[model samples]
Target chain A: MKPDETPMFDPSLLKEVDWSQNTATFSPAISPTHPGEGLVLRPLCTADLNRGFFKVLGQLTETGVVSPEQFMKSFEHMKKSGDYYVTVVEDVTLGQIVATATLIIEHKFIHSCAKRGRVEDVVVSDECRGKQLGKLLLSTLTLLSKKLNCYKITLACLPQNVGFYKKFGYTVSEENYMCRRFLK
Target chain B: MKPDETPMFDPSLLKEVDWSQNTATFSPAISPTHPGEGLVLRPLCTADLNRGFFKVLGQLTETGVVSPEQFMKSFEHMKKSGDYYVTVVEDVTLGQIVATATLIIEHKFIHSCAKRGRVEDVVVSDECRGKQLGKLLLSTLTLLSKKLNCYKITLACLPQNVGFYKKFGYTVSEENYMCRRFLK
Candidate 1:
């Protein structure tokens, strides 16, 4: 049995992943041994969001809180590719965009071949909550990174979002991850 | 030879009138008709410019007057996948991003199909101008849009950038286009 034939632990890929690993790959963890199973993902970019994407995302995010003027202004970067990035849009409204998220794939020279993907900007419209759009996007991206031969999918969401990601099998370890800053 | 092997006339692939006969299936005016020709273009969302992205972009635009930070802070629509979306980052400090005049192959929607791709957000970094990165990204996207089976590729740029795009075989026409209200 190849990687694709492995049962997709993710609910979204019941139909797609079971057939062939060639169609998907497993997102590995810190070491190459730990497998990130079930998720079927893709490397989505800025170009994936066009007029129609804005329209769909707009409809999902229309709440009077966010303005279309502000949204339409940012439609400039969706042109380049290969950056550690991914995005998903289900709806839009009034020239404004709503639902979307991204993953930043970081590379390490120490490991040389080690590539890691970090998921961020996971979101959905107030109107789109409970629709599983967010989950579906996450799963799709997971598989996508796998195909790209990434080692893992790690995300740092707000504590409020912890439970949401937990549903998809992410958790904050009790241990601390250290960091330092440079001063000018 | 099929259009796919050696892509046909520029106007035929890039303009509204060139695809007149196939309007029943696609207008090509509002969307793309090809895929896999080259650089993938889409919309820029706030998520795309998240803190991680901002770090690199900030470093690049820090000295410039474009004020990338200002745009990220004030824009609401940037929160979506449209608006100011960045192409997936293959390389942050080097390679053919804005520095190369790359054409963007973007995805969009139409009244008839579930989805379509477009050509928009074409740009080459000012310092890297005249190097043909623009044409590389553009023609690359054209091939990609064709491979994706889009309607056509369309892009809107400042008049000053006309000469660059023309080199890639695009023409300026009397089409009603929209811009940020404050741009004029």
Candidate 2:
């Protein structure tokens, strides 16, 4: 999207977050940590629907048809709410979202109402596996959370993903404990 | 607290969620839940500060000295964001909050940009243990998520709390995997 184009996400969401902390000097939009070669890490945007964003997410979990209008609806809702901070890695050459993670900042009555960061849905495209894109995403989100002043940052530690997160200073918190009630 | 008192939580939040669905007849402000005896279930409010709210949460996690000013700041932030739905079981007779749980709704790109309900920081005071207040809190939050149209709901499943959640239709999902970097 051009500077003149209507933005997909709210700028207020990035209020205290500085994107330059993770970006390179020359390649301002690209992460210095990416595996290199046409990979750009940035926030998710509306244009992603055309770039097979949902296809990549489908690999992690089932995403329905995701028609264009439905995408806009959700995006608009998130944009208006200013609570979602989802970032994705775009294989610019392929124009596809390869890696993704979300930082859901929560306000609470605990810790004097400090913001607790819960990182969710960290995934890399199947073809992009073993390329450390997962690491890039985690490092980015982790840093982002810290900058956002999150008192604590956490994510679901799947049994298979334990070793992967450990390398990045993560561990099994309390024995993969979360109950789910799927509505649909 | 009187109805004329400045509202604690945002009334806009309860706009779509009907309180009557979970409320009882004679005990309008209470849940049909509660093992009776002055136990009333309701959403968290600023008045909770005087009701030993932080003391109850401190039982689950270390809550430092939370002053009244800090409480208002957080409450104002949460009230404006309208993203936090924290419910508590108040023992009116004792004037204390015995149990608590929070449902942090996350807007996502997947599920066609659906809302994902994440239940967090569930705790029942030691004095209120064995009274099924835990069950009551979970049931209320779970139902609230459904009414709000969340595609799915989840919570951290602790080892000791497995059987407890299962009885309420919540099961361990993907083993306990969460990366936590505690700040301060």
Q: Which lDDT tens digits does candidate 1 get at residues B1-184? A: 1111111123233332233322122222223233222433232333433323333343333323324444443333222322122232213333222321123223222222212233433444445444344444554454545544554444555567666545534566433232111110
- The CA lDDT at B112 in model 2 is 66
Which ten contiguous residues of candidate 1 chain B have the minimum total lDDT? B1-10
Off by over 4 Å in 2: A1-35, B1-30, B33-37
TM match of model 1 to true structure: 0.31
lDDT (Cα, tens digit) per residue for candidate 2, span B1-184: 2222245454344333444544222322334343467776667788778887788899988777777777777766666666677777788888888888887777776666678788888888898786667656666677678777888777766588677666555677765566666543
Where does candidate 2 chain A have its weakest 10-residue lDDT segment? A23-32
Chain A TM-score, prediction 2 = 0.78
Extract clashing residue pairs from model 2.
Answer: A156-B177, A157-B177, A157-B178, A175-B176, A176-B175, A176-B176, A176-B177, A177-B157, A177-B176, A178-B157
